[model samples]
Target: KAFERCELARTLKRLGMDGYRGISLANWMCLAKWESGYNTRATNYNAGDRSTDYGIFQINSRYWCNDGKTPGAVNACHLSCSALLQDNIADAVACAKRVVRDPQGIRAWVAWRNRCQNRDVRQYVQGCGV
Candidate 1:
């Protein structure tokens, strides 16, 4: 499911992402837009770490989810990597919350810093009624 921009914004808002850990809904929106283009089933493999990033938020198996492949993975979310690929994003959203709880905050996602940080991210949720 590749969501429309506003649709994702509203969905995240409804899921309580608007201000989770001081990260605004628009910042989350920008993260999704750059991470996976709102596609629920997206995946990216990193040969260096032999780990895969899964789903919309691209939660990585090396630290967040267990794929039974990533060496020394922590599985901080305590979930299988497959969970992040589902069309129903509740699990992914939950894992994302755990990620931001860390000291890095939204900076946990490199794309958020490279693309969303210090940008006019309000455009992501504009008119979403969030």
Candidate 2:
């Protein structure tokens, strides 16, 4: 099921990510909207490779998770990709925080780089009252 727009905003806010590293809740919310459509079980498999993206963050198995069969998988989050697909977003949120801390920061998300970069996102959370 897709999460309510405001539900996501509040979650990010409560997790201490409102203005983390200059990436505002607007950015995160936009990324989540495009990434997973706010569905916790979101998963996208590579058409040519065995790797996949999991959960709200669309975290790639090649760099952040191990699907138990993807060779050379890094598993940087130290958790199974399935763990990210659960209703509980704690694991996904934690791993995403790590991803943002990497040198690339929010650029790691193509959606952010391609769609949300430098755009005014104040309206993304305007009605949510976050």
Model 2 residue runs over 4 Å out of place are none
What is the Å distance of residue 113 in model 1 from its true position? 0.9
Per-prediction TM-score: 0.98, 0.94
Assess the local accuracy of residue 111 in candidate 2 as a C-alpha lDDT between 0 and 100: 87
Winner by TM-score: 1
Candidates in order have lDDT scores of 0.93, 0.87
**lDDT tens string, model 2, 1-130?**
5789898899889988887877889999989988988998998989778889999989999989889877788988898898899887888988998898898999998888887888877767888878
Q: After superposition, how far is residue 49 of candidate 1 from its true place, in Å?
A: 1.1
Q: Residues 98-117, candidate 1: write the lDDT tens digits.
A: 99999999998899989999
lDDT of prediction 2: 0.87
Q: Cα-based RMSD of the predictions, in order?
A: 0.6, 1.1
Off by over 4 Å in 1: none
